[PDB]
Design an enzyme around this catalytic site. Structure first.
Site, PDB file in Angstrom:
ATOM      1  N   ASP A   1       0.819  -1.039   0.000  1.00  0.00           N
ATOM      2  CA  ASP A   1       0.000   0.000   0.000  1.00  0.00           C
ATOM      3  C   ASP A   1       1.030   1.306   0.000  1.00  0.00           C
ATOM      4  OD1 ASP A   1      -1.425   2.142   1.672  1.00  0.00           O
ATOM      5  OD2 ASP A   1       0.406   2.201   2.946  1.00  0.00           O
TER       6      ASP A   1
ATOM      7  N   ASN B   1      -5.614   1.205   7.881  1.00  0.00           N
ATOM      8  CA  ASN B   1      -6.403   0.786   6.728  1.00  0.00           C
ATOM      9  C   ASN B   1      -5.820  -0.458   6.053  1.00  0.00           C
ATOM     10  OD1 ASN B   1      -4.280   1.557   5.065  1.00  0.00           O
ATOM     11  ND2 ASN B   1      -5.251   3.436   4.333  1.00  0.00           N
TER      12      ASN B   1
ATOM     13  N   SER C   1      -0.348   1.257   8.105  1.00  0.00           N
ATOM     14  CA  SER C   1      -1.366   1.845   8.965  1.00  0.00           C
ATOM     15  C   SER C   1      -2.653   1.050   9.104  1.00  0.00           C
ATOM     16  CB  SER C   1      -1.711   3.259   8.490  1.00  0.00           C
ATOM     17  OG  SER C   1      -2.624   3.214   7.408  1.00  0.00           O
TER      18      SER C   1
ATOM     19  N   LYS D   1      -9.477  -3.055   1.923  1.00  0.00           N
ATOM     20  CA  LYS D   1      -8.505  -3.573   0.968  1.00  0.00           C
ATOM     21  C   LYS D   1      -8.522  -5.084   0.777  1.00  0.00           C
ATOM     22  CE  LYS D   1      -5.316   0.315   1.752  1.00  0.00           C
ATOM     23  NZ  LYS D   1      -3.885   0.674   1.970  1.00  0.00           N
TER      24      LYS D   1
END
Ligand SMILES: [Mg+2]
Length: 268
Positions: A7, A216, A214, A190
């Site tokens: 990411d 997310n 992080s 995700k």
């Protein structure tokens, strides 16, 4: 390993928001030769994400908007959607907060009040390359699937409860990946976006490598067999991920890719 997912903010990108293109390009060509797919999973807008891979945009896959928009081989595979009533409700609620500045994220573009402070708009423009000023948040002709608020993500904890009762599961707060709060459709994270690609490729989490830093990235890292937390990753993320790598300013993500190519630890 058959899939490598990374990411972007705080991971694939250093603090200056750049990466070693020559090194990555060489690595990618080898991955391609080995038939290993590459995936970018980020909270950023699809149009902002492809600006980072101009030369490979139609070859790699994207799980954008924190999971609400998925592209595979240059073609849209899936996009989430808030019903018109749902978006009206969420926007109505956000409007109740006078100190809030926010962006409404849609399929064709993101949107922000023409009256929002320039400083805020300038920051959001770094994550939404398609960002259009509007006179009102309620008359948007687009399908909306996410919101980005100017509230620090550190405040999520104080925010979930307030939002839970005010919005009731229509949306949930998660980090945007760049320090602030994203409001996403529950379930469209995700890992869920990555599952759509895996299903189409007939592969399993068993063949997945994921790299994050992080909140997310929680479900993505918990899902992947080879989960890696950047050296700069948050505590709970280092706890969730099985493996570690260098920080984002030291090509931490590229070093994971190198481990795959040279089959070094943890791949054996
Ligand atoms: Mg990140």
């Amino acid at each position: 390993v058959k899939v490598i997912v990374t990411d972007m903010d705080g991971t694939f990108l250093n603090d200056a928001k750049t990466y070693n293109q020559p090194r990555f390009m060489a690595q990618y060509q080898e991955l391609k030769k080995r038939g290993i797919k590459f995936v970018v999973a980020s909270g950023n807008q699809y149009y902002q994400l492809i600006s980072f891979f101009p030369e490979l945009k139609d070859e790699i896959s994207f799980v954008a908007e924190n999971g609400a928009l998925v592209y595979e081989h240059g073609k849209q595979l899936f996009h989430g959607e808030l019903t018109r009533h749902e978006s009206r409700i969420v926007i109505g609620e956000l409007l109740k907060d006078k100190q809030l500045n926010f962006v409404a994220c849609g399929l064709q573009s993101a949107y922000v009040s023409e009256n929002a402070p320039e400083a805020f708009v300038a920051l959001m423009a770094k994550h939404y390359h398609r960002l259009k000023p509007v006179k009102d948040y309620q008359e948007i002709d687009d399908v909306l699937f996410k919101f980005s608020l100017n509230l620090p993500d550190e405040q999520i904890p104080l925010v979930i409860d307030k939002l839970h009762v005010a919005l009731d599961g229509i949306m949930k707060p998660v980090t945007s990946g760049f320090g602030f709060i994203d409001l996403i459709i529950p379930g469209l994270h995700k890992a869920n976006g990555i599952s759509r690609l895996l299903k189409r490729w007939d592969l399993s989490p068993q063949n997945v490598v994921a790299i994050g830093d992080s909140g997310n990235d929680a479900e993505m890292l918990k899902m992947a067999r080879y989960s890696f937390a950047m050296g700069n990753a948050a505590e709970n993320i280092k706890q969730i991920a099985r493996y570690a790598t260098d920080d984002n300013n030291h090509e931490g993500a590229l070093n994971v890719i190198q481990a795959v190519l040279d089959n070094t630890y943890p791949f054996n």
